[PDB]
Structures are given as C-alpha cells and as structure tokens.
C-alpha cells in the first residue's frame, strides 16, 4: 500500500539520495541483546547481556578473542559477526608473522570498514547485520572502538549498541569523567551499571546473563563468563 | 457407492427411494467400525479405508453432503488424522486429512449446524491431542465457509466460542497454539466480536502466579505434564495474541493497551516468551506499512515501550 | 488462517525495515517441521531418541537411520529427511578423521558442532542436528539449528512436536538424572507426540557413555526398555 | 625380464606368460598371474615397469567392460587393441608414461583369432606369434622354424613347451612355472600351468 | 519443492516396475508398454545392467534415466578402479540418489525425475533390493513396486511375500510374475523379466521361458479354484 | 629394517624389527615398525620412517572414513589398493616405502606387499626392508600353513633374530602382533640380545 522502489537493492539510490538497505541493515544490531562497552586510563572492558533459549540452554556467547590484545562484542546477526572475527583473527596472525608486532586496533577497524563497505556497493549482497564493540590494548593504550552496518566507524570514550541501548547511553554519558581514572574493579562496576539500565526492571543481572571480558596493559584479553564474573558481580549495589 | 447412493435425495417434495439408502448402509458400517471406534480391529482398518474413499469421491457427487450418520464416522478420522502433513503417514492418515478437508468444506443445512458442533465438541473433549488440534482445523474451515449459516443461529456462536477458549487452556502446546490461530481468524472475520467479558478473560488467567518451585529438585518424581499455573498464563497470553494478530494492517483503539500487556509477559518463562515474541514480531512486520497512521494511535510513552523490545530470535545475538 | 503478507517477506537477502530477514525466517521454521528427535544429557551418558515412521512392513527398518555415528565418542540425531543432512553429516565425519590425523586425538563435541555450522554458513541448510557425545569435559549435548546457532542443552528436542516436548522436557530434567532414567522419559514424552504404542519400528534409541563408544540401542535391547515403560 | 607369448592358430590363440613377481635379487611371489581379463573373449598380457603395468591394464579393463554394461555388445578384438594403443600413445609425451609392453591375443566372430605385439612406444602390430621379455630373443627362433599357418591345438601347445624347455636350458634367469590360456569360439579356456 | 512433485508425476506414469529379494536370486520384472505399428521394441528396454552384480530398473522420463545410468555405469568401474572391489548395491543407491539431489545447475530441473529399483548381489554374497526417487532418499525392501500401479501391487507383495514364497527360484520369478500380472494383464506378452542369480551374469529370460512360467501360475490358480 | 608375514592355519603372523637409523648412527632402538589401522588390520613399516608414517596413517584415517561412511569395516584387498594409489600417484618422486597389508576380513586371513615402485601383491609368506633375504631364507625353510602358533611364533622370531645378527641396519627388539578371526592380538615384545642367550645357550 505504501511500497518505496528504492528499497529493493543496496546498489539503488534513492530519489532523497539515501540507500534504504545500508539503514534497514542499521537497525539489525538494535535486534541484538545490549552490550556496554567503556575505557580507563590502563584497561578497556566490554559487558554484555546474554539471552538463552530455554532453561536447559546454555545462552548465546555475545564476547569473542580476536587476539591476544583485542577482543570483540557482537550485536545483531551472529553469522555475519562470525564471518568478521575469522578475518579479524586471521589479520591479527598475520601481523604477528610478518612484524612480530600486535596490530595496531585502529588499523584493524580500518580494515574492518574496508571488508564491509564492499557488500554496500555491489549488486546482490547484504550489507553486514552486525554490529561491533571492539576493546582493544596497543602502544597508543586502552582502545575502545563500535563498528555499524553502513561500514562507519567510531573511536568511543565509551558506547552501549543492541536493544535499550540508549539507557546504557545515558548512563554512560553522565559518568563519563569518572571513567578515566577508574581502577578496573570500578571500571567493570560502571559497564555493569549501564548494563543494568538497559535491563527491564524485573529482571536483574545474573551470573547466568552476564559476560565480561577486559583487556589492560598487563593483561591479555580475558572473557569471564558464569562464577568468573560473581567477584565482579558481588561488588554492585541493589538497583536503585 | 457414491452412484449407489445418489438417487436417495433431501430435495424437496420427494417421495423415499426404493434404491439404497445412505442412512442406512453408514448405521451398518458405524456398528462394524465399533471396536476401532486385535482380529477385529484389523478387520475394521481394511473397512475404514475403503468407507473414506467413498465420502471422499462424495463429496461433490452428493445432491445433499453431510448426512446425519456420516458426521457420527468423523471422530474416528479426527484420531487417525496427522496433525502435520507428510507422505510417510500410511496412506489411512493421509486419506484421513485430504477427507477431513472435504468435508469441513461442505455446505451444512442449518439443521445439521447443531449436530456437527455436539460432534465437535465431544473430540475436543477427546483424549488424543491430534483428535483435539484437528477439531480446531476442521472448525476453522468449516466456520469460513457457510459463516453466514452459523452466524444466524447465535447458539452456534456461542458454542465455537466456548470451544476455541476451552482448547485454549488445553494441556498441549500445540492445540493451544491451534486454538488462538482459530480466534485470531474468527475475530478477524467477525464471526467473533472481542468483547468485554472476552478480555477480562484473558486479563485474569494471564495474571497467574507462577508455582515458583520445583518438584525435580527433591527428586523421586515424573512430571512429564506441565505445571498447571505455566498453562494458565499461555492461555490468557496466547488470547491477548489472537487479538492483536486479529487486525494485521490496522491498529483499533482497544490494540496498544494490549500491546503494553503483551510487553510486559515478554520475560516470563518459556512458552510464554515464544509466544509473546511471535506476536510483536508479526505485529511490526505488518503494521510497517501505514506506521505513520497506526503511531498517531499510541501515546508517546506507549510507543517508546514497544520500540524497546527485543523480539529477535535467536540466529540475531 | 487469512493471508498476511507484507511487502518486505520473501525478499531474499533484502533486509526489512525493521533489520529482520524474513525469508530466512520462513526457510528455518519449514526445516523445523521434520520428526520428533529427544536428547537429554546426564552426568551417566548422552541418550538420543528418535521415530523412525517407515511406511510399509516389506521396507528394512534399518534403511531409515536417524540417528548416525560421526565417531566413536559422537552421535547424531536428526529430524527431517536423511538426504538433507547427508552433506552436513559427512563434513564432521571427514572433519573428526581430518583432526585425528592433524593433532593425535579426539574432537570435542563443540569444536565438531563448530565445523558443520562453518559448512552451514559456507544458506539455510535445511536440516537441524543434535549432537551427542562423551569428550575431555564429559557427557555434553550440543543443538545446531537450521540457522547454525550452535548452543549446549541439556535437553533438547528437534522437530514437528518439539515445542510441546521441550516444556514437557523441562519439568522432567533434572540435574542429577541416571542415563536409564533419562531412557525412560525421552520415550515416555515421545509417546506423548507419537501417540503411537512404541515399538521397534516406531522408535530408535543411541547412548554414548563415558567408558561405551556410540552405541544404538538392538531391537532385543530397544524392547526390554519399551516394556518397562 | 618378465616373458610372455602368443601362437595365433587356425581357429584359437595360444597364450603363456611366467607367473613370478620379483624384487631386486628374490622372487616375491611364484603364483603371479599377468593375464588380464577384459572381455569374455579378450585377454591383456602386460609386462614392464613396476606400478605401469597394474594401473594401465586395469584402466584398459575397465573401459572395456564399461563399453559392454553401455552398449551390450562387446569390443573387437581389433577396437580394443586400437583403444590401447590411442591411450598408451598419448602418455608418451604426458609428464606421466606408462612403460608397459603387450600382447592383446582376442577372438572376434566376425574376424576370427587375432594376435596383437605393442612395445612400450605403443606400436601395434598383427602378428601370427609374439613374445615380449629377455626370453624372446632365445624363443622367437623356435616359434619361426616350427610354426606352420595351420597349427593343431594340441601341437601349438607342444610348441609352446618347446619355447619353455629352451628358456630353462639358456635363459639367466630362473621362470619355473608358466601361466597357459588358450581362446576360441567357446571362450577364454585356462590350461593346466607347464612346470619345471 | 515443486520440481520434485512435477518429477514424482512422471514417475507414477511410468510403466510398473516390481523386484524381489531372494536368498539365491534377485529379480527384477518391468511391465512392457506398446510401441506403434512401424516401431522397433529393440531400444526400449527399461531393465539395464549398471555392472556385473548390479541391475537397475526405472520407472520416469526415458532422457533423465540414460544420464543416470551413464553415470552409475561409469561410477561402478571407478569404484572398482580405486578399490579393487565389486560395488556394494547401496554404495550405488546412494550415488544415484546423491545424482537426483543434483543435477548440477542451480534449478534447472535438479531432480533427475527417475525412480529405480536397483536390485543385485554384494562381495559377500548377501542379495539386496533398494529405491530411490526424485527426492534423493534411498530405502532398502525385501520387495517393493513402482510406476503405474505401485501400490495396489505393494499390498499383493505384503501379503503373498513369506519364507515359503523364496524357498526356490522358480518361486521367487513366479512371485514377480503374479505382481506384475496384476498391474499388467497379459501372458509373456506385456512382461520383461530379469534373473541376477547368484554370482551369475544377469539374464534377460527369453519370451518363451516367461511364458512357461505364467503359464505354470494359471495351472495352480486352476488346482487352487 | 627387518619385517616379516605369514599365513597359516591359525591366522596371519606379523613381526618386525626396532632400528632406526640415519646414516650408520642408530638414532632408534624402540621404533614400532607395525601400525594398527583398525582391530583387524595391520601395516608394516619399511623403507623411509617419515614417507611409511605418514601414508599409513592417512590409510588408517581413509579406512575410518569408509567404516563411518559404508558402516562395514574396508577389506584388506581394498586397503592395499587404496595405498598403492595414493604412493603411485607419486611415483618417481623420492618416497621410499615398502609395506605389508595384514588383516582378517571377509574373504578370510590376508597379505598383501605394496611398494612406493607401485607393486601390489598377494601370498602367503612376505618379507621387506634391508635384512628381508635373510629372514626370507630362515621362514622358508621353517615354514608351514600347518604350523601350531607356539610353532609360528617361534619362526617369526627366530627369522627376525637371524636377520639382525646379518644386518647392520635390523636391530632392536622382535615386535610380534597375531591378526586371528577375533582381531590383531600383540604377542611379545623381545630384545634380540635376550633372544641371543635363548638361541645360543
Ligand atoms: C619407522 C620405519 C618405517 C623406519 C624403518 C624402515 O626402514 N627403519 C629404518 O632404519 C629407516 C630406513 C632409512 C635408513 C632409509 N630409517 C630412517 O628412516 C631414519 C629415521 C631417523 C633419522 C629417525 N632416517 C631418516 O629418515 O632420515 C632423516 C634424516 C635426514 C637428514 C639427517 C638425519 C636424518
């Protein structure tokens, strides 16, 4: 009844001079469960929600390794987001090989844009229904970063993507300053909190639902997942 | 036999036949096809196979379908029917469908309208969960066609009513899917008109307290049934669902009040959150269209809950 | 029961506007719509239950496997039809063996899941898998949907009925449920769906247990368990 | 090194070949058969490199039983030979050559025995008898004086002991036992092996 | 979906083709439809020999069969290139099915539109009877029918198949006879019937030997009235 | 590298040699020359360690693959083919490997030889690697398919023994497996300066 033409490809231009499919896609990662992810002066860490199928299903795992130094947060369809961490990784290996040097993040992101731009201007592919947060440590130091299905690409103090990301947005925003300066225990309190908002107000985080995972400048990337994330957990104060 | 039995006619003005009757050549096969209803019930198999490859080529033949003695033969097929489709069914499960089919699809006498709902209800009260999800079909059919007919007698409203609620709260998550399909259709149809008692209906068995314990953890036990309270809050959930799905492309005044309700079930255990999940997301799809209409419908803070609401399924996240 | 197509269904790789892909969705739910298959995990063992519906009594029962032996420690059940799945069970079969010879030792359940749902996205798939094995950390049941989410369950139940017997599943389980137990009420609730009596022909039962390799359950064997019931 | 022969009589031909595989220095096996089957009136004696002679024979082989299950009807002898030769032929000049020397003895309805010579170099010739193999030189000469157009069975079998009672009295190399076929109208016939 | 119901319509059509398993012998009979005045019956057969112990017969569109016999043919003499071993009947089946899940073309009629019953004798001797179709699955049967008239002969097969029916070979051929004769009525006239035996070529019997065979059923049908 | 087969009326006999050696340095006394493919089927190992290990061992995974695939064990004629396919294709190319296929199938007890020249062959008796002529003569001589297996154990370790004490590259100690209906069964394992004392007291 109210059918657009300019919808049905990535490749057409619509008569507005937008490309309809690249902001479909777009909204694939608010389909996704919300994942927070922010920075201090030493440490990146990336929280996120799982959600299971059942009771007897473990839960989907939102957090990935891509390398030693790098690690990644997934929102929207997890088989694009699969096909990313395999390029990721391998990039980071290579990288290894030939210089025996962790890749730099910000030379990753950029390569990430690149793969994903490709499927934005050829005729029969889907731009990528994902949407990334990558934590990350290099010589610059703690890198936050979120990548989108148009291919554009952000350097965060700190960012929140899936379904009632806003909230976490918001709470991130407010307590933004204190971030920097934080120690990692209160630096994983913070992204929790922001979580929290995301969260209706009758569920509350679970050692179950929540996934952890923290880069610093003496430690590797760690996805705490289960009893791991409790001490982390325990820390919290009721919900308000 | 369909030949047979094509002089015998209802029409009207007409004298009885002196060739044979239907009445009763059915009551004959209705007393041999008892026991199914092991020697004996391997003798009536053969039987039923070739007695529903007659109804079937009678189904268009016949100058007046649905014979009195013919609807008492249709529990039997309700049990023996598959309640999904496939060529693997033994060819009696598969003949047993394409027949149930044809007959749904037949137009009924309003006198025979009473008589086929006693039919259908005593199935529904069957034991067998395929006899009950494939009442829920036939009823769907046979109500689309001949609405008008069931419509006038306000009794038979009032009946399929009862029976698509009562097989709402049924114990199978199946049936009871089944039974908001039906209730969405006829709601949407307006053969069924949501009212108020409808809804205070659904309200109550949807607030339901869950048990909140469990008998596994003590041990010693079997539960294979599922837990009552969990079946109550489906029902009054999968209602609630059938009214929104009720109206694909139009959101009506009483619509985002529901929605708010749906919202608020979406964390509640499975079956509930499937259900909850199916019924949004279908709701989105197909209110997309003319959203600029159906928004003005919603107050601000109303849409600001819908649109914060994960429905995804599982392959996103 | 009246037709509600919206303009965005069955676009192929078009995102909606929502950012759903419809038809992908339509193609998985059809794939769902095969027989009934049960897994349930206990610390004992994993035991997969299926029915094997054969049409006529000239046709050998065995010719219609449902459940196949990717390897000694793995098994899988399906729903849906064999033809379907024969690529995807090959792949973890020639993968499993590819492992051995690489690395000296067994897959685990999870990695071996990984590679079919590697093949799947390399697309619906059309079939959904369950896969049952003993590994390093023990008895372990894994779910791949036609999409290729892979998680661990529990219990898990594949096809036509599987929404009823997952709820029936759950009040059942529980953690510290023996392997005969287990047996016992995955056929209890397949009889349910089946609402058929349960005989050889109708059903067929594998175990994987730490010390056993993959075995399926012989018509003698499937019997003494079916009376008990 | 490994010997075979063939004596093309009226209305049969007459095939031996030495039944032992060897290594370097020691035989193997003394029970090796280097007749292949192809058709039910075909035979493929093969003889040469290692590894050569199993794959392309069998390669022959079953080309040949695969034209019988397409067609129903069997090969000449004459195609079958010319199909050999094509394919060795071709491998000459591939990075792979086989090194395979043959003899194609065959009956055809139509064209009556045939006796077919094909060296590693795929040259095919008709021949009323061949032999392949170090042993040849020494019983070429005994098949030449004795052998008459119109040979008995009987005699063509007495001739071909001849041929291997001088390859034990001359020949270096020890080839106690010989595998006998002879084809005509009624098939391949095997015969008892001659021993020494 | 559509392509694969379009290829089962041809195979229905398709003139009846019945196999039993046998402890000896495994045999394979296929109804013979007229041709036309002028036409030679020489090159409708319907009944082919993939290998030396295995037969296949065909029910479907005449075209898709001879690419899929071709390619089992072929397949057969690979197999045995390879291995060293005559095909096992289920190694065949299942190539054959894997064939009509792919034509090879994205759409483009994928099923092959050939249902066969391909009946024959392992290495180790066990007789084996198998069906495939349109959709790619392959089933084993101790007897099985397709093409017109599959399914009332199917239910003959149930109840006439016993051990007593596969006690001989003559009454394992007889029991082929009788389903054929069923779908197909006629003596020797309208039947093609086809003996595997046990480590024996397969044989075409003659028209003369099948009619002394049906001529052998209706001389105990007179003694059973 | 000495390895040793046998069929008798008991089954198949498979023995073999421990030494590995680069050059004349003994790198290895405790090399398992003979591989277990499956419960029914053996390899033998001769000629290059790395090109017989790593043929056998992707003989072993084909074999397991067609197990899975056939559900029906490979025979031991189908085996031998399949190795003497994959080294032919490489022919010319350097592999060294001299092998004995022994199992139970089907069919019954089976040998066969294949080489990296590419022959396959069956028999009764076989021998490969440097001191096979002289475990080749010390079987033949005590050979019989009517031979007990407390008889049959003794030839095979005693051809084995009579081959090191010849040959600077055979050494080690007398691996002995039995491939018997049931399945292979390990017999003995025994240090030819143990078996020395034995044979010379
Ligand atoms: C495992 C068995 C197959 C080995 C068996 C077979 O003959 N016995 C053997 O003696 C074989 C035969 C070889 C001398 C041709 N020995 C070997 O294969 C030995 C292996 C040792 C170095 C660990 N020689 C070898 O493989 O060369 C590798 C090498 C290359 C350069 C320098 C040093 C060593």
Redesign the interface.
């Known amino acids: 009844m109210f059918r657009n033409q300019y919808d049905n490809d990535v490749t057409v231009w619509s008569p507005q001079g937008r490309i309809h499919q690249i902001e479909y896609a777009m909204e694939a990662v608010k389909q996704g469960s919300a994942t927070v992810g922010l920075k201090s002066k030493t440490h990146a860490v990336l929280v996120a929600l799982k959600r299971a199928q059942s009771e007897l299903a473990a839960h989907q795992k939102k957090i990935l390794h891509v390398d030693n130094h790098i690690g990644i947060s997934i929102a929207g369809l997890t088989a694009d987001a699969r096909l990313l961490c395999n390029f990721m990784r391998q990039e980071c290996l290579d990288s290894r090989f030939v210089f025996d040097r962790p890749l730099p993040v910000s030379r990753l992101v950029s390569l990430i844009g690149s793969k994903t731009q490709i499927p934005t201007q050829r005729y029969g592919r889907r731009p990528y229904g994902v949407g990334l947060l990558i934590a990350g440590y290099d010589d610059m130091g703690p890198h936050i970063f979120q990548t989108c299905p148009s291919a554009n690409y952000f350097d965060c103090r700190a960012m929140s993507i899936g379904a009632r990301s806003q909230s976490a947005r918001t709470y991130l925003e407010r307590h933004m300053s204190e971030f920097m300066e934080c120690n990692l225990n209160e630096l994983v309190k913070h992204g929790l909190r922001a979580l929290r908002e995301t969260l209706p107000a009758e569920q509350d985080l679970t050692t179950k639902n929540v996934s952890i995972g923290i880069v610093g400048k003496d430690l590797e990337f760690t996805i705490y997942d289960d009893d791991d994330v409790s001490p982390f957990l325990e820390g919290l104060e009721e919900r308000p | 036999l369909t030949y047979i039995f094509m002089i015998d006619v209802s029409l009207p003005n007409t004298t009885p036949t002196i060739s044979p009757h239907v009445p009763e050549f059915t009551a004959r096969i209705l007393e041999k096809l008892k026991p199914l209803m092991e020697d004996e019930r391997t003798q009536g198999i053969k039987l039923l196979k070739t007695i529903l490859k007659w109804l079937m080529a009678s189904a268009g033949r016949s100058f007046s379908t649905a014979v009195t003695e013919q609807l008492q033969l249709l529990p039997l097929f309700f049990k023996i029917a598959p309640v999904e489709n496939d060529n693997s069914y033994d060819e009696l499960k598969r003949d047993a469908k394409l027949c149930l089919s044809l007959m749904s699809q037949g137009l009924l006498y309003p006198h025979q309208v009473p008589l086929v709902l006693q039919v259908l209800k005593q199935t529904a009260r069957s034991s067998s969960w395929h006899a009950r999800y494939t009442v829920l079909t036939y009823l769907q059919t046979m109500v689309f066609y001949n609405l008008f007919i069931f419509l006038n007698n306000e009794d038979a409203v009032k009946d399929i009513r009862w029976l698509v609620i009562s097989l709402l709260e049924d114990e199978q998550l199946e049936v009871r899917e089944m039974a908001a399909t039906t209730l969405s259709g006829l709601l949407q149809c307006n053969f069924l008109t949501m009212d108020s008692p409808m809804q205070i209906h659904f309200e109550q068995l949807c607030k339901t307290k869950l048990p909140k314990k469990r008998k596994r953890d003590p041990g010693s036990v079997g539960d294979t049934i599922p837990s009552a309270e969990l079946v109550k809050r489906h029902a009054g959930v999968l209602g609630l669902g059938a009214c929104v799905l009720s109206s694909p492309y139009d959101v009506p005044t009483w619509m985002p009040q529901l929605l708010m309700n749906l919202s608020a079930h979406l964390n509640d255990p499975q079956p509930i959150e499937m259900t909850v999940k199916k019924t949004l997301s279908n709701f989105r799809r197909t209110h997309h269209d003319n959203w600029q209409e159906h928004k003005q419908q919603f107050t601000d803070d109303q849409l600001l809950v819908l649109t914060d609401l994960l429905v995804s399924p599982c392959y996103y996240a | 029961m009246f037709l509600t197509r919206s303009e965005y269904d069955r676009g192929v790789n078009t995102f909606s506007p929502e950012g759903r892909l419809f038809q992908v969705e339509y193609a998985i739910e059809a794939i769902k719509l095969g027989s009934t298959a049960i897994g349930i995990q206990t610390s004992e063992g994993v035991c997969l239950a299926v029915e094997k519906r054969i049409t006529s009594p000239l046709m050998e029962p065995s010719s219609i496997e449902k459940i196949v032996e990717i390897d000694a420690h793995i098994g899988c059940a399906m729903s849906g039809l064999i033809a379907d799945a024969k690529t995807l069970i090959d792949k973890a079969r020639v993968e499993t063996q590819n492992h051995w010879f690489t690395y000296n030792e067994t897959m685990t359940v999870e990695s071996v899941t990984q590679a079919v749902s590697n093949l799947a996205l390399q697309r619906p798939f059309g079939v959904a898998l369950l896969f049952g094995g003993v590994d390093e950390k023990g008895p372990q049941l894994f779910h791949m949907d036609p999409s290729g989410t892979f998680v661990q369950c529990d219990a898990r139940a594949i096809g036509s009925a599987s929404e009823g017997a997952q709820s029936s599943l759950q009040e059942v389980y529980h953690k510290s449920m023996t392997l005969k137990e287990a047996i016992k009420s995955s056929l209890i609730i397949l009889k349910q769906v089946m609402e058929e009596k349960l005989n050889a022909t109708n059903i067929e039962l594998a175990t994987v247990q730490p010390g056993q390799n993959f075995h399926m359950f012989t018509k003698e064997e499937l019997e003494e368990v079916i009376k008990d019931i | 090194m490994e010997y075979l022969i063939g004596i093309q009589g009226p209305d049969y031909v007459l095939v031996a070949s030495d039944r032992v595989?060897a290594?370097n220095?020691?035989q193997?096996?003394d029970?090796?058969d280097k007749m292949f089957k192809m058709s039910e009136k075909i035979l493929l004696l093969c003889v040469g490199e290692?590894?050569?002679t199993?794959?392309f024979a069998?390669?022959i082989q079953?080309?040949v039983?695969?034209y019988k299950?397409?067609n129903?009807y069997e090969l000449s002898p004459t195609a079958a030979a010319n199909f050999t030769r094509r394919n060795l032929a071709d491998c000459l000049r591939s990075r792979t050559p086989y090194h395979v020397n043959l003899l194609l003895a065959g009956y055809d309805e139509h064209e009556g025995p045939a006796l077919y010579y094909m060296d590693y170099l795929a040259a095919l010739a008709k021949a009323p008898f061949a032999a392949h193999g170090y042993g040849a030189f020494l019983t070429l000469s005994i098949l030449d004086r004795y052998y008459t157009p119109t040979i008995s069975r009987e005699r063509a079998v007495e001739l071909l002991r001849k041929c291997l009672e001088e390859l034990q009295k001359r020949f270096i190399l020890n080839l106690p036992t010989f595998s006998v076929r002879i084809i005509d109208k009624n098939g391949i016939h095997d015969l008892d092996n001659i021993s020494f | 979906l559509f392509q694969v119901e379009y290829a089962q319509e041809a195979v229905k059509k398709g003139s009846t083709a019945v196999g039993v398993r046998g402890r000896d012998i495994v045999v394979l009979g296929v109804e013979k439809k007229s041709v036309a005045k002028l036409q030679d019956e020489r090159t409708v057969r319907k009944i082919c020999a993939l290998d030396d112990n295995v037969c296949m017969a065909f029910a479907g569109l005449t075209a898709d069969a001879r690419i899929v016999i071709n390619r089992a043919r072929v397949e057969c003499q690979s197999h045995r290139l390879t291995v060293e071993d005559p095909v096992t009947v289920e190694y065949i089946t299942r190539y054959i099915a894997s064939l009509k899940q792919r034509y090879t073309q994205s759409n483009g009629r994928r099923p092959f539109g050939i249902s066969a019953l391909i009946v024959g004798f392992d290495f180790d001797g066990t007789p084996r009877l198998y069906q495939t179709d349109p959709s790619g699955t392959y089933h084993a049967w101790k007897a099985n029918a397709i093409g017109r008239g599959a399914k009332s002969v199917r239910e003959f097969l149930e109840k006439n198949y016993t051990d007593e029916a596969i006690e001989t070979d003559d009454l394992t051929i007889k029991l082929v006879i009788k389903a054929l004769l069923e779908v197909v009525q006629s003596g020797g006239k309208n039947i093609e019937l086809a003996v595997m035996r046990r480590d024996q070529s397969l044989k075409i019997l003659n028209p003369e030997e099948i009619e002394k065979y049906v001529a052998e059923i209706e001389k105990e049908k007179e003694e059973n009235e | 590298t000495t390895t040793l087969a046998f069929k008798f009326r008991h089954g198949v006999i498979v023995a073999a040699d421990s030494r590995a050696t680069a050059g004349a340095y003994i790198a290895s006394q405790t090399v398992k020359k003979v591989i277990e493919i499956n419960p029914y089927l053996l390899g033998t190992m001769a000629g290059g360690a790395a090109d017989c290990s790593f043929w056998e061992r992707l003989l072993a995974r084909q074999c397991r693959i067609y197990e899975l695939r056939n559900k029906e064990r490979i025979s031991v004629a189908a085996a031998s083919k399949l190795l003497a396919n994959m080294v032919y294709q490489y022919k010319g190319m350097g592999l060294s490997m001299g092998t004995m296929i022994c199992g139970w199938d089907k069919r019954g007890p089976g040998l066969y030889y294949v080489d990296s020249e590419g022959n396959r062959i069956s028999g009764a008796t076989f021998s490969v690697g440097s001191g096979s002529v002289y475990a080749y003569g010390v079987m033949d001589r005590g050979y019989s398919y009517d031979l007990e297996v407390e008889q049959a154990y003794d030839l095979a370790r005693r051809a084995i023994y009579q081959a090191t004490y010849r040959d600077a590259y055979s050494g080690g100690a007398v691996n002995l497996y039995h491939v018997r209906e049931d399945g292979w069964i390990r017999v003995s394992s025994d240090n030819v300066a143990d078996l020395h004392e034995k044979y010379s007291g």
């Open positions: 595989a290594s220095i020691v193997m096996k029970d090796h290692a590894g050569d199993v794959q069998e390669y079953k080309n039983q695969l299950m397409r129903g």
